[PDB]
Amino acid sequence: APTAPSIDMYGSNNLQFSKIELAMETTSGYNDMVKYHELAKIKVKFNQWSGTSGDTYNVYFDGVKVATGAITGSQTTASFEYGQGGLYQMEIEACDATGCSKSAPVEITIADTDGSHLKPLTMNVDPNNKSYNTDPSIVMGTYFVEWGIYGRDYTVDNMPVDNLTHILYGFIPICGPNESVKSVGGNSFNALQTACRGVNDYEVVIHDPWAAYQKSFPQAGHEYSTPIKGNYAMLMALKQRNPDLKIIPSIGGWTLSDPFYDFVDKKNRDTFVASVKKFLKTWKFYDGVDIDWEFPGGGGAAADKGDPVNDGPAYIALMRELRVMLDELEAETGRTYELTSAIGVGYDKIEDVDYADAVQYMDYIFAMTYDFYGGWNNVPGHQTALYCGSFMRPGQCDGGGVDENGEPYKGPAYTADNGIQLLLAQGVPANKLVLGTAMYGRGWEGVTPDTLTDPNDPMTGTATGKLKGSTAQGVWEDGVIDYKGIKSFMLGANNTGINGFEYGYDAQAEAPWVWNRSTGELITFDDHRSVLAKGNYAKSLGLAGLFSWEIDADNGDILNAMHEGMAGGVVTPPN
Numbered sequence: 260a261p262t263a264p265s266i267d268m269y270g271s272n273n274l275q276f277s278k279i280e281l282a283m284e285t286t287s288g289y290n291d292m293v294k295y296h297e298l299a300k301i302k303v304k305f306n307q308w309s310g311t312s313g314d315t316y317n318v319y320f321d322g323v324k325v326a327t328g329a330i331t332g333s334q335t336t337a338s339f340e341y342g343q344g345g346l347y348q349m350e351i352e353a354c355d356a357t358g359c360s361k362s363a364p365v366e367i368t369i370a371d372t373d374g375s376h377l378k379p380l381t382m383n384v385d386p387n388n389k390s391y392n393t394d395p396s397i398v399m400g401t402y403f404v405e406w407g408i409y410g411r412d413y414t415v416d417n418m419p420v421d422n423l424t425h426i427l428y429g430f431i432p433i434c435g436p437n438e439s440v441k442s443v444g445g446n447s448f449n450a451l452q453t454a455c456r457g458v459n460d461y462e463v464v465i466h467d468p469w470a471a472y473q474k475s476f477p478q479a480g481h482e483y484s485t486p487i488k489g490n491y492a493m494l495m496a497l498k499q500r501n502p503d504l505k506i507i508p509s510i511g512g513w514t515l516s517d518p519f520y521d522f523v524d525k526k527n528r529d530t531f532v533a534s535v536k537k538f539l540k541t542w543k544f545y546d547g548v549d550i551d552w553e554f555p556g557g558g559g560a561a562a563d564k565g566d567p568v569n570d571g572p573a574y575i576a577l578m579r580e581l582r583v584m585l586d587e588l589e590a591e592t593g594r595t596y597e598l599t600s601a602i603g604v605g606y607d608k609i610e611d612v613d614y615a616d617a618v619q620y621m622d623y624i625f626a627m628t629y630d631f632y633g634g635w636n637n638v639p640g641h642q643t644a645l646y647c648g649s650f651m652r653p654g655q656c657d658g659g660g661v662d663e664n665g666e667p668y669k670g671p672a673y674t675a676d677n678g679i680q681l682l683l684a685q686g687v688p689a690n691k692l693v694l695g696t697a698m699y700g701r702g703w704e705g706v707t708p709d710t711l712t713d714p715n716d717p718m719t720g721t722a723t724g725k726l727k728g729s730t731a732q733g734v735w736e737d738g739v740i741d742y743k744g745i746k747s748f749m750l751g752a753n754n755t756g757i758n759g760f761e762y763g764y765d766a767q768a769e770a771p772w773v774w775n776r777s778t779g780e781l782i783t784f785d786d787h788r789s790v791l792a793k794g795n796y797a798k799s800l801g802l803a804g805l806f807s808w809e810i811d812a813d814n815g816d817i818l819n820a821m822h823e824g825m826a827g828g829v830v831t832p833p834n
């Protein structure tokens with residue numbers, strides 16, 4: 260027989276192969292950092308210094324022949340292509356007429372962006388997240404933010420994945436006009452400019468490649484030379500742990516919606532949709548796309564953008580065209596892809612899209628039932644309430660009344676039910692609607708007792724400015740505080756108030772607040788009670804389920820209540 264091949268491990272990249280090439284120690288344009296191959300190029304060097312070398316080699320993976328070629332003297336390079344990621348026991352055999360001899364087996368890794376080479380992620384979840392047996396039909400969604408791995412120190416292995424059906428990954432930008440990003444300050448706009456160098460306008464990119472795929476996370480077993488790292492490698496490993504989980508990239512959001520206003524021109528939609536198809540071929544752990552245009556018709560971060568006539572038809576066409584594209588991927592891969600969107604629920608947002616048309620293309624609508632009131636002005640109110648609060652004036656709820664100055668309300672008040680009923684009334688199916696819950700509060704200072712028109716209700720007072728605090732308190736920007744910060748700094752473990760705060764609840768609205776009457780600090784948020792109320796509202800209307808913004812800000816209480824309030828329920832999945 261020929262002499263047995265001896266594999267040159269260091270001449271063969273230590274048998275580490277990847278279908279994706281990712282730049283690691285630089286930051287450049289997306290097309291120069293990320294290169295995907297449908298087939299991995301495998302090259303394995305071996306030698307046969309003694310004896311006879313033979314004529315032909317065969318490569319085996321787990322005892323199955325995967326490649327063959329010619330032997331070239333005493334040193335040979337086996338070169339072949341292979342599509343399926345994984346870890347395999349490789350042998351190389353040399354053959355002639357006399358017989359065959361084979362190497363010892365050695366593990367080869369073929370990395371792919373489905374995580375097929377990875378073991379299930381090891382989790383590190385706060386034990387306050389409890390276990391439930393919610394029916395698998397109901398949506399239990401959350402948004403994980405790319406930048407949460409910095410000061411917020413919240414990583415993929417912290418997510419209570421057994422309590423989630425859908426993870427929406429916030430946020431993938433679109434190259435093009437993005438002045439709104441400058442409102443974040445810091446490096447955000449300039450990082451986008453770098454990502455978009457060499458990229459056509461209206462194509463998607465990764466905003467922060469360090470967070471997405473370069474940073475080594477030791478809890479994930481990464482080392483510097485691992486070929487895929489960051490959040491994305493952790494999501495791939497999470498998908499091996501929980502294969503029925505859906506992970507969906509979120510395009511847009513408040514600061515990254517400016518390019519959508521150019522989708523009135525179909526050419527720009529075509530460019531965008533093609534780029535999304537490429538993205539989903541590159542990053543196989545993703546299961547669809549979520550479009551978070553804030554908002555058709557305007558009213559978002561860009562005060563100079565919005566077209567009430569033309570943006571709705573553009574939105575619908577986008578959905579049409581995305582669903583054509585996703586059907587191409589389902590034909591090509593055999594998988595199921597979802598198309599979703601998060602939408603505004605003020606009457607003035609909903610009136611600018613004919614959702615009876617759009618929703619036929621969509622799996623789910625994540626209704627943004629939060630941010631109804633907040634620190635952008637000095638008017639208290641319930642930011643995430645189901646129904647109209649006591650503080651509202653006569654005819655404010657339904658919009659038929661007049662304000663304190665005698666000026667007509669322009670439409671129904673900002674509540675979750677007013678928006679859900681406008682969507683239902685034009686024919687959006689309940690079982691495609693997902694109701695939002697807030698894992699944060701918004702708040703004010705200066706709401707002292709002398710400003711209240713009803714002494715029992717701080718929502719009738721007036722503010723002097725935003726809530727101020729530190730990042731240790733969960734105050735990452737003025738006027739906004741993580742729920743886990745409200746629980747540590749204002750509620751306490753027994754939920755009866757600490758630090759000078761008192762707890763109250765508007766039973767009509769289904770909305771909690773905490774108020775420090777000495778500082779006039781007032782915070783509107785979702786709590787156990789209001790989230791139970793949202794779950795029972797969702798059961799009563801036959802909504803698809805609940806989702807939450809944003810998962811790093813919870814301590815377990817909000818997601819627990821989401822499942823609590825859904826107990827016993829099932830829903831028809833969209834088909």
Ligand SMILES: CCCn1cnc2c1c(=O)n(CCCCC(C)=O)c(=O)n2C
Nearest residue numbers: 406430443446447450466467468469514
């Ligand atoms: C409201 C919280 C602030 N905020 C809201 N949206 C945000 C941010 C933010 O801070 N960054 C930082 C990106 C820098 C990327 C890189 C390559 O370094 C963002 O990208 N986005 C979308």
Ligand SMILES: CCCn1cnc2c1c(=O)n(CCCCC(C)=O)c(=O)n2C
Nearest residue numbers: 513558603604605606608630631635673
């Ligand atoms: C994340 C951005 C917060 N943020 C910062 N400034 C804001 C917002 C906000 O959310 N809304 C509400 C949007 C429309 C809500 C509705 C139709 O129900 C605002 O009006 N302004 C000025």
